[PDB]
Amino acid sequence: LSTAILKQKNRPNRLIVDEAINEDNSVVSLSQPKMDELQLFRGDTVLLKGKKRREAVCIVLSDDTCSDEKIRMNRVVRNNLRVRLGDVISIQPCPDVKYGKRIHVLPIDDTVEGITGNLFEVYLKPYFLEAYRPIRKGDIFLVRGGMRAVEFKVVETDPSPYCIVAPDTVIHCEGEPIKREDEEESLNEVGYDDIGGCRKQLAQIKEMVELPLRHPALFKEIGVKPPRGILLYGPPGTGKTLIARAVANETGAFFFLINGPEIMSKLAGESESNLRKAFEEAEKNAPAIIFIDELDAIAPKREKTHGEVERRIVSQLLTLMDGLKQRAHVIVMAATNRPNSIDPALRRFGRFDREVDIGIPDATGRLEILQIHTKNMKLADDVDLEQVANETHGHVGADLAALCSEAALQAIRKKMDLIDLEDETIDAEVMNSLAVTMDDFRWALSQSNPSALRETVVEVPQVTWEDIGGLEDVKRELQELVQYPVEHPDKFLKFGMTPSKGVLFYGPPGCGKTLLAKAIANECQANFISIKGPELLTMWFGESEANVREIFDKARQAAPCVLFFDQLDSIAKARGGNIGDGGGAADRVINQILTEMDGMSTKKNVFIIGATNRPDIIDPAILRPGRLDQLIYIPLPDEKSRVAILKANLRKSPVAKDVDLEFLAKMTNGFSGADLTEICQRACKLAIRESIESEIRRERERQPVPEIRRDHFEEAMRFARRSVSDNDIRKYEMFAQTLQQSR
């Protein structure tokens, strides 16, 4: 119930926005029982409160067809109130609305292009002649007249912001034409409703910022001071500065914006004075909100700062934050991608004391974000955004916006066959037939990738489970560990049993350890991170473990995720394996991997997979419970599995019907999966050699091979060798025997 502040509550003034029947730009209608409930009289002026602090004046009337909870209200004041159909607005009477003296209204530039008539007599005089229409400073109204309808913007009113347009009120239209860009930017201004997937964080921010500034007495009587510093921290793209934009657009208090690097100045000491002057500018316009974007830019650790001016700036900020209690009416926010780099003194109680964590949205959060970004988008009927939000597993809101933009560009590509770039104009019918479909979202989802992982992505060959032969039980387990919590989250969480956070693959080389990982990457609907072992190591001190920390943190945001540590022999070898280990850089890397895997334990599933080649050198601390709990032995295929391996490799290759894949398996008593592949590649190469010789033979006399035959496999069989010998197999069993005895 921490979101009770978000709940819009029941107010009699609340009404639903609906299409108008006869309502013009200055009159609205309410139902007669609602008029009697609100004590609203016909002919009274009423005020409508919408989103983004947008307000308008209209006359209230009675309509017997109007629902009680609903209002009849036309589109001009819809755009004025910045609301759409279905929205909830507030209505109250406004007394003491006097006759207007002078108003300055100016047309919209694109609504008057090519128009040279007398604007007053054609447009303003007939519309306001003896109508007594109520207006507001900044109102937009559409007037019919001349050869094309014209919209105007009110620029000045006398008095302001409310007055009555009387027949003797001075109305003039001279002035510079208002550009469309300003009106469009004001219309597309961001509000709270733009924000999705962070309702809890939105409630926290509102009750930390808006409620104290709006009602300081409500806190005063109970005797608790408002929170003076709020820190918004999270991974890039989550919507921190979007929250800042929403607050700045829909708060009552004056808003001051500070960008960290902007504080810097060349003159000696002027940067601290700039921070100071910003704070006193907040002082004069109290109450106020200060937003310090990129706080880590100007607030590093003073223990680690090598510059005098930066250290002075941090200390000056600390002094200002300490005095912020003396201010009593100023609230400061800060957004940072790395909260850990900020000096801890700025995180002490009384300085950024309450920290809000803007996190990765869930499935319903991603659905909300997608719906928000598709509100201006035009969609067909086949589109279902719930599936799209389901398929985006680790995507942050910025990634979802990128997905929507890519899908729109894909629809534009689909229409690019008809549209011509070099054309001076675009046809109307082609423009109208343009629309976004499910196929565009599916293409975008194909090309979609979280921005956090673009540095860990690798191009993996196309591998599907049918490509892998044998290991049928192993395949089921891998789907039973990965696919069930991904597809059935409710089952696992309800039971409450602790999961295995690892599956170590130990087996002879070429038996499918890496292919199973490729199958996970291509099929399983979870973000995949492939870590080649010795990538994380760095010769420079401290960074080698840092790369381990960031990678483990990197998979943390994108849960569901699979962290594939290929060849654990390098990063995680036995403690004391380097008996000297004077530097300890390898040892500290092994310890760091231990810290992270034990460090995180929560509902969101992050699977760590290691495809070790020879598992005995691995530190057993990795294999001990709590880390890599489940182990799968990837064995050499038997006679039945080998036939599947031969079929899976040869399924895309045209082969003779005479070739018996069952016969080849029993001859290959001990061959691995890779060895069976070499038999097929060797046979394929021999067929190519014949085809090259055949085509040379035919062209030589003038101046082939449709499929691999039985003789081709016969010639390729003699070159075949058994890669992994019997002695190598025993050690792989020996590791299992030692673990089984301990188990």
Ligand X SMILES: Nc1ncnc2c1ncn2[C@@H]1O[C@H](COP(=O)(O)OP(=O)(O)OP(=O)(O)O)[C@@H](O)[C@H]1O
> Binding of ligand X at residue 689 (CB under 6 A)?
no
Answer with the entry of ligand X, a copy of itself, Mg ion, none that 225 interacts with (C-beta below 5 to 8 A by kind): a copy of itself
Peptide bond into 161 cis (omega under 30): yes
> Binding of a copy of itself at residue 466 (CB under 8 A)?
no
Q: Closest Cα partner for 200 from 33, 4, 459?
A: 4
> Binding of a copy of itself at residue 692 (CB under 8 A)?
yes
- Closer to Mg ion by CB, 179 or 325: give it: 325
State the Cα–Cα distance between residues 515 and 566, nearest whole angstrom: 11
Calculate the dihedral angle through the C-alpha atoms of 690, 691, 692, 693, rounding to the nearest 10 degrees: 50
State the Cα–Cα distance between residues 158 and 332, nearest whole angstrom: 36
> Could you tell me which residues come within 8 angstroms of residue 207 by beta carbon, excluding any fewer than 6 positions away?
5
> Binding of a copy of itself at residue 207 (CB under 8 A)?
yes
Among 621, 661, 729, 739, binds ligand X (CB under 6 A): 621
> Binding of ligand X at residue 210 (CB under 6 A)?
no
336 labeled binding residue: no
Q: Interface mask (CB under 8 A) for a copy of itself, residues 8-47, using x and -? A: xx-x------------------------------------
Neighbour count for residue 152 (Cβ, 10 Å): 22
State the Cα–Cα distance between residues 395 and 362, nearest whole angstrom: 9
Among 32, 337, 371, 437, binds a copy of itself (CB under 8 A): 337
Among 32, 90, 241, 677, binds Mg ion (CB under 5 A): 241
What is the pairing mode between strands 561-566 and 88-93? unpaired
Segment contacting ligand X (CB under 6 A): 74-82, 240-248, 260-268, 652-660? Answer: 240-248
> Binding of a copy of itself at residue 661 (CB under 8 A)?
no
* Angle, in degrees to the nearest 10, between helices 710-718 and 673-702: 120
State the Cα–Cα distance between residues 152 and 127, nearest whole angstrom: 12
> Binding of a copy of itself at residue 293 (CB under 8 A)?
yes
513 labeled binding residue: yes
- Closer to a copy of itself by CB, 602 or 741: give it: 602
684 labeled binding residue: no
> Binding of ligand X at residue 613 (CB under 6 A)?
yes
In contact, 190 and 375? CB cutoff 8 Å: no
Among 103, 299, 645, 716, binds ligand X (CB under 6 A): 645
Q: Closest Cα partner for 481 from 598, 593, 609?
A: 609
> Binding of ligand X at residue 239 (CB under 6 A)?
yes
Provide the minimum distance between the beta carbon of 332 and a copy of itself in the complex, in angstroms, as a whole number.
14
Provide the minimum distance between the beta carbon of 510 and Mg ion in the complex, in angstroms, as a whole number.
9
- Closer to ligand X by CB, 35 or 645: give it: 645
Provide the minimum distance between the beta carbon of 59 and ligand X in the complex, in angstroms, as a whole number.
36
Among 386, 480, 639, 733, binds a copy of itself (CB under 8 A): 480
Answer with the entry of a copy of itself, Mg ion, ligand X, none that 195 interacts with (C-beta below 5 to 8 A by kind): ligand X
> Binding of Mg ion at residue 514 (CB under 5 A)?
yes
Residue ranges in 571-610 that form contacts with ligand X under rule CB under 6 A: 598
> Binding of ligand X at residue 197 (CB under 6 A)?
yes
> Binding of ligand X at residue 241 (CB under 6 A)?
yes
The structure tokens listed for 223 are: 């005797």
- Closer to ligand X by CB, 583 or 670: give it: 670
Answer with the entry of Mg ion, a copy of itself, ligand X, none that 369 interacts with (C-beta below 5 to 8 A by kind): ligand X
Calculate the dihedral angle through the C-alpha atoms of 533, 534, 536, 537, rounding to the nearest 10 degrees: 150
Q: Closest Cα partner for 617 from 492, 446, 742, 735?
A: 735
> Binding of a copy of itself at residue 631 (CB under 8 A)?
yes
Calculate the dihedral angle through the C-alpha atoms of 117, 123, 129, 133, rounding to the nearest 10 degrees: -160
Q: Interface mask (CB under 6 A) for ligand X, residues 395-424, using x and -? A: --xx--x-----------------------
The site for a copy of itself, by CB under 8 A, has a size of: 227
> Binding of a copy of itself at residue 638 (CB under 8 A)?
no
Structural element, H or E, at residue 429:
helix 428-433
Segment contacting a copy of itself (CB under 8 A): 23-31, 75-83, 153-161, 667-675? Answer: 667-675
Name where the chain breaks: residue before each gap, C-N > 2.5 Å.
453, 703
Q: Which residues pair with 156 in a beta bridge?
A: 104
State the Cα–Cα distance between residues 351 and 317, nearest whole angstrom: 10
As separate numbers, helices (DSSP H) first and strands (DSSP E) second, the chain gives: 29, 22
Provide the minimum distance between the beta carbon of 367 and Mg ion in the complex, in angstroms, as a whole number.
23
Answer with the entry of Mg ion, a copy of itself, ligand X, none that 376 interacts with (C-beta below 5 to 8 A by kind): a copy of itself
Phi–psi pair at 506, nearest 5 degrees: -120, 125
Provide the minimum distance between the beta carbon of 51 and a copy of itself in the complex, in angstroms, as a whole number.
11
Q: Interface mask (CB under 8 A) for a copy of itself, residues 526-565, using x and -? A: ----x-xxxx-xxxxxxxxxx--xx-------------x-
DSSP string, 438-500: HHHHHHHHHH---S----S--------GGGS-S-HHHHHHHHHHHHHHHH-HHHHHHH-PPPP
Provide the minimum distance between the beta carbon of 153 and Mg ion in the complex, in angstroms, as a whole number.
31
- Closer to ligand X by CB, 106 or 558: give it: 558
Residue ranges in 506-545 that form contacts with ligand X under rule CB under 6 A: 507, 509-515
Among 38, 166, 173, 377, binds a copy of itself (CB under 8 A): 377
Amino acid present at 331: I
The structure tokens listed for 663 are: 């016969």
Beta strands in 337-443 (DSSP E): 354-357
* Angle, in degrees to the nearest 10, between helices 673-702 and 639-650: 40
Q: Closest Cα partner for 573 from 586, 555, 558, 560?
A: 586
397 labeled binding residue: no
> Binding of a copy of itself at residue 681 (CB under 8 A)?
yes
Q: Closest Cα partner for 544 from 502, 591, 577, 507?
A: 591
How far does the chain reach from its first CA to its final CA, in angstroms? 47
Among 62, 67, 315, 337, binds ligand X (CB under 6 A): 337
The structure tokens listed for 176 are: 């510079």
State the Cα–Cα distance between residues 1 and 4, nearest whole angstrom: 6
Provide the minimum distance between the beta carbon of 624 and ligand X in the complex, in angstroms, as a whole number.
5
Nearest position to Mg ion, beta carbon: 241
Among 307, 381, 429, 740, binds a copy of itself (CB under 8 A): 307
Mapped onto helix, strand or coil, the DSSP state of residue 374 is coil
Q: Interface mask (CB under 8 A) for a copy of itself, residues 265-284, using x and -? A: xxxxxxxxx--x--------
The structure tokens listed for 502 are: 């690892």
Amino acid present at 179: K
393 labeled binding residue: no
Angle at 509 between CA 503 and CA 513, to 5 degrees: 30
In contact, 323 and 283? CB cutoff 8 Å: no
Residue ranges in 162-201 that form contacts with a copy of itself under rule CB under 8 A: 181
Binding site for ligand X (CB under 6 A): 194-198, 236-242, 318, 322, 335, 337, 345, 350, 369, 372, 397-398, 401, 468-471, 507, 509-515, 598, 611, 613, 621, 624, 626, 645, 648-649, 673-674, 677
Binding residue numbers: 236-242, 337, 373, 510-515
Residue numbering of the annotated binding site for ATP: 236-242, 337, 373, 510-515
Return residues touching Mg ion (CB under 5 A): 241, 514
